[PDB]
Amino acid sequence: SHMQEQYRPEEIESKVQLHWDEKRTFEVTEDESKEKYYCLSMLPYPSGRLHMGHVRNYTIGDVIARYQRMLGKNVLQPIGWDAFGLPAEGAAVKNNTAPAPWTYDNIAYMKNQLKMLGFGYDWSRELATCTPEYYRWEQKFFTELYKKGLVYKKTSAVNWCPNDQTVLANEQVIDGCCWRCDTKVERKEIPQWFIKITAYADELLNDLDKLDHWPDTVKTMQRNWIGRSEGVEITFNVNDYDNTLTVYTTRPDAFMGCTYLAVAAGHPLAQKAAENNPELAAFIDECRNTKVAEAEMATMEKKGVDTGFKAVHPLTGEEIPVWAANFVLMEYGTGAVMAVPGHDQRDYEFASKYGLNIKPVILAADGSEPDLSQQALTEKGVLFNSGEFNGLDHEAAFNAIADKLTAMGVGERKVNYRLRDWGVSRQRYWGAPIPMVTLEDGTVMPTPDDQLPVILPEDVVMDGITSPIKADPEWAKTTVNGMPALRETDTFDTFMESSWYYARYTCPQYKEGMLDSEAANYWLPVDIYIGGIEHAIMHLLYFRFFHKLMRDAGMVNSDEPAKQLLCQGMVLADAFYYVGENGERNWVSPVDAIVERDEKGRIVKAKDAAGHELVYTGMSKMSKSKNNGIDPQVMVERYGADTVRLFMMFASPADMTLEWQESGVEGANRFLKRVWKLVYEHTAKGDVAALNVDALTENQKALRRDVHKTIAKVTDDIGRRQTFNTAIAAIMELMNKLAKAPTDGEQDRALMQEALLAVVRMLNPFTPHICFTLWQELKGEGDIDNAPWPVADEKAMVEDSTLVVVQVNGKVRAKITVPVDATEEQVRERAGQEHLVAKYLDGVTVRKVIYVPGKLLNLVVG
RNA sequence: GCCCGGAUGGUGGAAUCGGUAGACACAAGGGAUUUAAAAUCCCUCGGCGCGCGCUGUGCGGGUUCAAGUCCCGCUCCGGGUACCA
Ligand SMILES: CC(C)C[C@H](N)C(=O)NS(=O)(=O)OC[C@H]1O[C@@H](n2cnc3c(N)ncnc32)[C@H](O)[C@@H]1O
Ligand SMILES: CCC[C@H](N)C(=O)N[C@@H]1[C@H](O)[C@@H](CO)O[C@H]1n1cnc2c(N)ncnc21
Ligand SMILES: [Mg+2]
Ligand SMILES: [Zn+2]
């Protein structure tokens, strides 16, 4: 029980971290007496090392968790591991191991790094998603979803390197060819399992209105991703072809100006025409090189070839040419469209290139015929050049042609969504196996309940090309309904495990079912959910979707999983690479790469310690993929966890995208030494007297105002705003004022006790290790972790005056202190007494006066 | 391409509901203690020409008494784009 002069983190931090582990401070149960607060950070993929992206996410959470703990609540802050994934396979092959032990090594290493950063997690509720204790229940749930009719199998496009005969990911393809071998990747239609997320398309879209504490950035992204759309599916007939063509459109009003139809590459009409036509056959085989990604679909030049078959326009009775094209999506809509080039900018460029007919049917705003020499007229208006449908407005023209095509019996109104169904089949090893069984009959059915879980074997060896569970034919064998059967070798998408980990944290050792609803509904829904903006759409839409499925199974009460979403900004860093000797992308770290910069700041050249011409790919999010992550363990060993934690929070507000930099860490270490020095000098003098409230000087009253005003600001900045940089900045101001304040008399040292006890509590969320020690030295009640959050004294914060700015034609000339209860006439009189104000008022008249109470006075002058 | 964000001194940022632009820090320069250094404490710090005047928040216009903040048109950079997680 003795404080050193010098602040030594290495001696303090490890000793306090053991105390938290041994006393089980952050381990919690479902306490009915206390108020719950579920503070959830998104669980990491165990890549190997942590990086400053991870540190920002998990400090932000731990700040809120420790803050909410000090408000007197039972705070659950869990931590787990999204263990399944693609990187584990490639790394296992490269390092000559299996994917399982590689993943458990990386979990072990990262568990240490998190513990040394001192995040108050509930380690008794730890989860690894690659263990069968976890994935047994999602398998069991998948079979339940099949029996409800929410699962179905269909053919879907997949990236396929033809030589190796393996399914590649989107990341594994680069610049057309495959990243291993010099051979072009091709689209391959392959049967896969899907879950009907479109069944909950409206509910996912509509419930965004109820999420008031989610940011509008994420909500509007999810609305646009789902893309609910009311329109008409119009059917056609073809001359020398039996099968009809159905097309979707939101603009049936412009149907009479439909000069041609565009068709997707993988449409069954195009296959019939390609038998005789040699150039059309070459176009379809060229569309094999089209990648499975919407980025490369639209960015490329919109090419096309005439099919030959002429579709009959049902209303006009005219033959129109069907065309193949590489900008028309297969899975969105039917496959084909009703291309109106006169009133669509995408179709206009297609019609202008190939010289197709451009028919105008919609009048302009003024009632005049449109001018379609330069561009299309996307706007909606009155019809003309459309037979019986002339004169009608957009609302009438929508209904008229819809009622006509419903009456004719070759058309119907339909609610189409952009949202496609969630394809969950993957053909890799390191994943939870899909519980489906193909019998010797030929019939497919779910794996029965007694045979679950379908355990993935960890003890294996991988060649790299084919999966071990696929390669060995003995694994698939089983016996269902008293006959031979072959279970599904496809494994789940890793989003499957991340779509219910939040629920399983409430009851992670529960052997009887998927969720213990007593425990689940106590904690759920999640109060604050903290992740990257990267997961705005993909994960967060599955996350919610899965909650609604679990609700309909009677597992959980709430309609939504998370109350508040806090999407922190991506921690950015530069990313370099060089092409290998066999076309393999070797990403070099920024530390290794020597760089020559521009005068503005941009990068021009990029060498490395070896000597390769590196390819600079701009700033990008820290990740092991691009090899630009910065390990915090170097800075933690040098400066301490608290220093690194405080710097991450001080550099920018949570939601803002930060470019990572080393310059700034020294300011945090200097600040903590100043806090340590002020308490050392204070406590060394001795104990303190009781504080006399109404016996202070004007300096002492003003100082105590700034103490309680900081408590009000820091409470608002942490609680409501999550602007931790301004909260920390506010405390830095107070510490500078406390340093200058003399602590000679008993009233000053009594004030300094209240100040330091307040400042140490306000810093505890950010820098918990140093504050735990200083709390004992200031002689507070128990541990700082469970100690109460400071409440500001409204009597202490009362002002006797306020600053008023004086402007003359919107430009500041003087500044004055004025009493709070002061009229506009008193402020004008005081403002006139200033010499810089009266300088510009002479020779001219006061035309208009603008006065903001207690803030600003602007004099408009002629 | 499409959807969603971002840009403020040498650098990260502040200004919370249209109202003092640059709080709080880092880096740099000079001064002070110091056996020299480390460590600590001071001073200066957007630009152009003074105990003053104009100008200044990525670029071009606009509204207003007042714009970093609101409106219209752009540039550049990030995130997602359905098999990275
Ligand atoms: C639920 C599941 C789908 C999550 C998934 N397992 C996952 O994302 N795993 S993880 O290892 O990549 O990250 C864990 C957390 O850290 C954030 N993060 C990652 N990189 C950065 C960065 N450069 N900057 C800021 N934050 C980053 C990320 O959003 C997440 O909250
Ligand atoms: C006045 C011009 C009318 C225009 N010609 C039109 O009908 N466009 C379709 C519809 O209006 C819109 C719905 O999002 O996208 C188009 N669309 C529908 N399905 C698809 C698809 N599979 N691929 C590309 N676009 C599509
Ligand atoms: Mg700049
Ligand atoms: Zn290949």
- In sequence order, what DSSP letters do the residues of A136-167 get, joined into one string? HHHHHHHHHHHHTT-EEEEEEEEEEETTTTEE
Q: Is the dihedral of CA A492, A493, A496, A501 positive or negative?
A: positive
Is A624 annotated in some ligand binding site?
Answer: yes
- Residue A801 phi/psi, 5-degree rounding, is -160, 175
Ligand nearest to the Cα of A173, by number: 4
Resolution of this model in Å is 3.1
Does A87 sit behind a cis peptide bond, omega within 30 degrees of 0 on the bond before it? no
Using a 10 angstrom Cβ sphere, with 0-12 exposed, 13-18 middle and 19 or more buried, the burial of residue A70 is: buried
| A493-532 residues near strand B (Cβ < 7 Å) | 493-495, 498, 532
Closest-approach nucleotide to residue A619, Cα vs C1' = B78
Tell whether ligand 2 has an atom less than 6 A from the beta carbon of residue A339. Answer: yes
Could you give the dihedral angle defined by the CA atoms of residues A138, A144, A148 and A150, in that order, rounded to the nearest 10 degrees? 20
Cα of A224 to ligand 2 centre, how many Å? 15
- As a whole number of angstroms, the distance between CA A541 and CA A538 comes to 6
- As a whole number of angstroms, the distance between CA A837 and CA A801 comes to 21
Q: Kindly give the number of the ligand 1 atom that is closest to the alpha carbon of A569.
A: 25
- Look at the block and give the residue holding tokens 């109470």: A853
Residues 6+ apart with CB under 8 A from A841: A808, A832, A859, A861
Rounded to whole angstroms, the distance from the CA of residue A805 to the C1' of nucleotide B63 is 24
Work out if A830's Cβ lies within 7 angstroms of strand B. Answer: no
Ligand 2, from A320, A337, A350: best to mutate by most atoms within 8 Å of Cβ?
Answer: A337
Rounded to whole angstroms, the distance from the CA of residue A297 to the C1' of nucleotide B12 is 39
Beta partners for residue A596, in sequence order: A605
| A139-158 residues near strand B (Cβ < 7 Å) | 158
Q: Kindly give the number of the ligand 1 atom that is closest to the alpha carbon of A629.
A: 23
Cα of A217 to ligand 1 centre, how many Å? 18
- Look at the block and give the residue holding tokens 């007229």: A377
- Which of A678, A748, A808 shows the shortest CA–CA distance to A3? A678
- Look at the block and give the residue holding tokens 């199974």: A553
> Which strand ranges, in their side-by-side order, compose the sheet holding A422-423?
A166-167, A151-161, A186-195, A422-423
Closest residue (Cα, C1') to B16? A721
If you write DSSP's letter for every residue of A608-619 in order, what string do you get?
Answer: ESS----EEEEE
Does A453 sit behind a cis peptide bond, omega within 30 degrees of 0 on the bond before it? yes
- As a whole number of angstroms, the distance between CA A568 and CA A445 comes to 43
Q: Euclidean distance between the first and final Cα of chain A, in Å?
A: 73
Which of the 8 DSSP states describes residue A516? -
- As a whole number of angstroms, the distance between CA A102 and CA A94 comes to 11
Closest residue (Cα, C1') to B20? A805
- Which of A644, A784, A788, A671 shows the shortest CA–CA distance to A735? A671
- As a whole number of angstroms, the distance between CA A616 and CA A612 comes to 12
- As a whole number of angstroms, the distance between CA A1 and CA A24 comes to 23
Q: Kindly give the number of the ligand 1 atom that is closest to the alpha carbon of A530.
A: 31
- As a whole number of angstroms, the distance between CA A90 and CA A92 comes to 5
Residue A357 CB neighbours (<10 A): 12
Closest-approach nucleotide to residue A87, Cα vs C1' = B84
- As a whole number of angstroms, the distance between CA A147 and CA A861 comes to 79
Query: CA A11: distance to chain centroid?
Result: 38
- As a whole number of angstroms, the distance between CA A494 and CA A84 comes to 6
Degrees (nearest 5) of the Cα angle A712, A57, A72?
A: 45
Helix intervals (H) in A553-595:
none
Question: Contact at 8 Å (CB) between A123 and A505?
Answer: no
**Which residues surround ligand 1 with Cβ inside 6 Å?**
A 42-45, 53-54, 56-57, 82, 498, 531-532, 534-535, 539, 568, 570-571, 621-622
Ligand 2, from A224, A233, A250: best to mutate by most atoms within 8 Å of Cβ?
Answer: A250
- As a whole number of angstroms, the distance between CA A143 and CA A435 comes to 7
| A396-415 residues near strand B (Cβ < 7 Å) | none
- Look at the block and give the residue holding tokens 């689209």: A187
Beta partners for residue A166, in sequence order: A161
- As a whole number of angstroms, the distance between CA A407 and CA A718 comes to 62
Closest-approach nucleotide to residue A541, Cα vs C1' = B82
Work out if A828's Cβ lies within 7 angstroms of strand B. Answer: no
Token duo for residue A618: 């701009």
Helix, strand or coil for residue A728?
helix
Tell whether ligand 2 has an atom less than 6 A from the beta carbon of residue A250. Answer: yes
Cα of A566 to ligand 3 centre, how many Å? 27
Work out if A108's Cβ lies within 7 angstroms of strand B. Answer: no
In chain A, what is the greatest distance between 2 CA atoms, to the nearest angstrom?
Answer: 108
- As a whole number of angstroms, the distance between CA A226 and CA A201 comes to 7
Instruction: List bases, strand B, within 7 Å of protein CB.
Output: 1-6, 10-16, 19-21, 23-27, 39-41, 52-55, 65-67, 77-85
- Residue A580 phi/psi, 5-degree rounding, is -75, 180
Kindly report the protein residue whose alpha carbon is nearest to atom 10 of ligand 2. A249
- Which of A138, A155, A232, A163 shows the shortest CA–CA distance to A193? A155
Question: Contact at 8 Å (CB) between A42 and A532?
Answer: yes
- As a whole number of angstroms, the distance between CA A816 and CA A827 comes to 9
Work out if A661's Cβ lies within 7 angstroms of strand B. Answer: yes
- As a whole number of angstroms, the distance between CA A219 and CA A539 comes to 13
If you write DSSP's letter for every residue of A24-54 in order, what string do you get?
Answer: TTT-----SSSPEEEEEEPPPP--SS--HHH
- As a whole number of angstroms, the distance between CA A683 and CA A687 comes to 7
Tell whether ligand 2 has an atom less than 6 A from the beta carbon of residue A254. Answer: yes
Closest-approach nucleotide to residue A299, Cα vs C1' = B1
Closest residue (Cα, C1') to B7? A657
Q: Is the dihedral of CA A509, A42, A651, A110 positive or negative?
A: positive
- Which of A420, A435, A428 shows the shortest CA–CA distance to A144? A435
Token duo for residue A337: 């469209």
> Which strand ranges, in their side-by-side order, compose the sheet holding A846-852?
A812-819, A801-808, A856-861, A846-852
Closest-approach nucleotide to residue A46, Cα vs C1' = B85
Residues 6+ apart with CB under 8 A from A251: A231, A340, A343, A380
Cα of A354 to ligand 2 centre, how many Å? 19
Kindly report the protein residue whose alpha carbon is nearest to atom 7 of ligand 1. A44
Q: Kindly give the number of the ligand 1 atom that is closest to the alpha carbon of A621.
A: 23
Question: Contact at 8 Å (CB) between A732 and A710?
Answer: no
Could you give the dihedral angle defined by the CA atoms of residues A778, A784, A790 and A796, in that order, rounded to the nearest 10 degrees? 0
Token duo for residue A172: 């594994």
Cα of A44 to ligand 1 centre, how many Å? 6
Closest-approach nucleotide to residue A809, Cα vs C1' = B65
Rounded to whole angstroms, the distance from the CA of residue A632 to the C1' of nucleotide B7 is 28
Token duo for residue A96: 């000559």
- As a whole number of angstroms, the distance between CA A731 and CA A720 comes to 17
Strands A304-312 and A319-325, sheet pairing = antiparallel
Cα of A625 to ligand 4 centre, how many Å? 19
Question: Contact at 8 Å (CB) between A272 and A363?
Answer: no
Token duo for residue A212: 């008031």
Question: Contact at 8 Å (CB) between A538 and A494?
Answer: no
Ligand 1, from A57, A497, A541, A657: best to mutate by most atoms within 8 Å of Cβ?
Answer: A57
Buried b vs exposed e over A544-575: b needs ≥16 C-beta within 10 Å? bbbbbbbeeeebbebebbbbbbbbbbbbbbbb
Token duo for residue A90: 């490639």
Work out if A733's Cβ lies within 7 angstroms of strand B. Answer: yes
Rounded to whole angstroms, the distance from the CA of residue A230 to the C1' of nucleotide B60 is 40
Question: Contact at 8 Å (CB) between A531 and A57?
Answer: yes
| A567-586 residues near strand B (Cβ < 7 Å) | 570, 572
- As a whole number of angstroms, the distance between CA A749 and CA A745 comes to 7
Question: Contact at 8 Å (CB) between A762 and A710?
Answer: yes
- Look at the block and give the residue holding tokens 């990029």: A606
- Look at the block and give the residue holding tokens 């011409």: A613
- As a whole number of angstroms, the distance between CA A24 and CA A245 comes to 67
Question: Contact at 8 Å (CB) between A165 and A427?
Answer: no
Residues 6+ apart with CB under 8 A from A146: A436, A446
Q: Solved by what technique?
A: X-ray
